[PDB]
Design a protein around this ligand. Structure first.
Ligand SMILES: CC(C)CN(C[C@@H](O)[C@H](Cc1ccccc1)NC(=O)O[C@@H]1C[C@@H]2CCO[C@@H]2C1)S(=O)(=O)c1ccc(CO)cc1
Ligand SMILES: [Cl-]
Ligand SMILES: [Cl-]
Ligand SMILES: [Cl-]
Ligand code: NA
Ligand code: NA
Lengths: 99, 99
């Protein structure tokens, strides 16, 4: 699809068996999801942006379905105000910015 | 252009006669630039990023070039890790996300 930016580019994702809404975010290096359980090992990380930093759990090799497209990669889990699909997964679905 | 996302989508902007680097950020509603002088009056605004809310200075109807495209719109000035071009100006340059 071609998604315009008049509104937030929100899509449906499936992660850990759960359906969520998330933002397709070219400004995010990595994918960040609101607190949930995921299987396997994790390690702590701090990530920062406007307003400062938050502590997250870094889970590697996690599958997400993004608008119907399967991708695998790292997912950070923590107290983000919005679920964010970052570049690490946007690349896997072939997403581009065009103008 | 068609910009892939393996790297940060950094572009050159021109504001106030100065060249700066900025990030094309589809997860940002608004355009946020580091401290600089801009003409005219400003209004207060609070924005909520990943780590919390901050105060910024809102300047309306500012001339800004983005990757060679002309925009005139709202620029927020305040402490951000990098200059970010949000959807308010991404729409003016005709940007869409595609996959
Ligand atoms: C500031 C950027 C360089 C990095 N951000 C991605 C942005 O699109 C970030 C995504 C986001 C975060 C919280 C709430 C809503 C959206 N938008 C952002 O700050 O936009 C600001 C905040 C205001 C609400 C959204 O638009 C307004 C302008 S981020 O801090 O969320 C981030 C930082 C580290 C990682 C890990 O790589 C992922 C995301
Ligand atoms: Cl990854
Ligand atoms: Cl590619
Ligand atoms: Cl605007
Ligand atoms: Na894992
Ligand atoms: Na103004």
């Amino acid at each position: 699809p071609q998604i315009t930016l008049w509104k937030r580019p929100l899509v449906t994702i499936k992660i850990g068996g759960q359906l969520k809404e998330a933002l397709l975010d070219t400004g995010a290096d990595d994918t960040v999801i609101e607190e949930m359980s995921l299987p396997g090992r994790w390690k702590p990380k701090m990530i920062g942006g406007i307003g400062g930093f938050i502590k997250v759990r870094q889970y590697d090799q996690i599958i997400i379905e993004i608008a119907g497209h399967k991708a695998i990669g790292t997912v950070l889990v923590g107290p983000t105000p919005v679920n964010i699909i970052g570049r690490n997964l946007l690349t896997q679905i072939g997403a581009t910015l065009n103008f």
